[PDB]
C-alpha cells in the first residue's frame, strides 16, 4: 500500500475504534500492564536515580529515568556536580537521541538543566505545563523575560531577546552564555492543553509542533521536551511529532499503530503518556493530521 492508502485503512478503521466500547480504556490498560511486567521483572534498572546523591533531584519519587536510556552529563561546572539528571533519550523515526524528555527543573537542578541543554547543543525546549497547577508548584523558573535583564544559573547566563505571542502558546528567544560563547535558544511555552474530547481544540498542539519543526526541521540536535514530570503531556508532543515525521515524509508504516508507537517510547522513558484522556489526544490528533494529508 502506498501512503494515501495506509491512511485510509487508518481513517477507515476509525469509525470502528471510535464506537467500540472502552476501546482506549482496555487499550491503555495494556500499557499500564506493560510497565508492570517490565517492572516486576526488574527489566530496567534505575540505581542511578536510586542513588542518594540524586533523590533530591527527583521531582516525583515515582517518575524515575532509566539508566539504559537516561542522559549523562559530562560538561563539568564544579565538583558540586554529578553526571545524573532526570531525563531520557527518546529515539526518532531515523535515529536514537532524537528527543530529551525531562522533568520540570527543581531549584536544585536549574544548573544541570543548562548543562544538559548546552552539552548537547540543544536548540529548542518545549515547556508543556504552567508554573502553577492545582494550587501547587509544578515547574521552577529557568527562563528569562523582557526588561528582566539576564538570569544567572551556576556558570550559565540566560537573557531574553524577544517573545512571540501566538494564541495558546508563546515563543521565547533566549540567549544563553557560557565561557565566552553565546548560542541562541528558541524555547516554546504551551499553557492551554487541548480538549481530548473536543475536536476543534487540538489544533493548538499541532500548531506548536508545526512551528517547532518549522524551526528545526531536521534531527541534527535533540529537542528538549518537558512537562511537570516530563511524562504525560511530554510523550504526547513526541508521539504527535514522530508520527508527523513519518507523515511529512511519505513513510507511514502499513501496520502503523499509535499503540505500538507509544508502547515503544515507554521502554526508553517511563510512564510516557500517563492517562487515558492523553492516550486519546495522541490518537485524535494523529487522526486529525491524517485527515489533513488527504
Amino acid at each position: 500500500m502506498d501512503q494515501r492508502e495506509i491512511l485510509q485503512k487508518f481513517l477507515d478503521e476509525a469509525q470502528s475504534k471510535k464506537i467500540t466500547k472502552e476501546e482506549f480504556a482496555n487499550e491503555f490498560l495494556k500499557l499500564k500492564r506493560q510497565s508492570t511486567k517490565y517492572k516486576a521483572d526488574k527489566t530496567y534498572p534505575t540505581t542511578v536515580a536510586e542513588k542518594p546523591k540524586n533523590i533530591k533531584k527527583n521531582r516525583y519519587k515515582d517518575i524515575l529515568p532509566y539508566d539504559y536510556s537516561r542522559v549523562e552529563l559530562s560538561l563539568i561546572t564544579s565538583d558540586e556536580d554529578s553526571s545524573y539528571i532526570n531525563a531520557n533519550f527518546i529515539k526518532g523515526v531515523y535515529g536514537p537521541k532524537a528527543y530529551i524528555a525531562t522533568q520540570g527543573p527543581l531549584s536544585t537542578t536549574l544548573l544541570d538543566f543548562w548543562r544538559m541543554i548546552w552539552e548537547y547543543s540543544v536548540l529548542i525546549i518545549v515547556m508543556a505545563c504552567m508554573e502553577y497547577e492545582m494550587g501547587k508548584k509544578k515547574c521552577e523558573r529557568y527562563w528569562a523575560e523582557p526588561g528582566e535583564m539576564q538570569l544567572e544559573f551556576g556558570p550559565f547566563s540566560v537573557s531574553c531577546e524577544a517573545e512571540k505571542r501566538k494564541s495558546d502558546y508563546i515563543i521565547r528567544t533566549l540567549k544563553v552564555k557560557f565561557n565566552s560563547e553565546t548560542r541562541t535558544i528558541y524555547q516554546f511555552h504551551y499553557k492551554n492543553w487541548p480538549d481530548h474530547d473536543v475536536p476543534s481544540s487540538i489544533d493548538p498542539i499541532l500548531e506548536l509542533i508545526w512551528d517547532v519543526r518549522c524551526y528545526q526541521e531536521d534531527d541534527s540536535v535533540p529537542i528538549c521536551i518537558h512537562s511537570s514530570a516530563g511524562c504525560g503531556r511530554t510523550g504526547v508532543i513526541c508521539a504527535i511529532d514522530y508520527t508527523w515525521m513519518l507523515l511529512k515524509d511519505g513513510i507511514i508504516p502499513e501496520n502503523f499503530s499509535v499503540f505500538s508507537l507509544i508502547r515503544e517510547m515507554r521502554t526508553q522513558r517511563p510512564s510516557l503518556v500517563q492517562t487515558q484522556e492523553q492516550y486519546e489526544l495522541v490518537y485524535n490528533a494523529v487522526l486529525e493530521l491524517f485527515k489533513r494529508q488527504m
Partner: peptide
C-alpha cells in the same frame, strides 16, 4: 513536589 506524579485514576 514529592507527592508522586502517579496519583490520578
Amino acid at each position: 513536589d514529592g507527592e508522586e506524579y502517579d496519583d490520578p485514576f
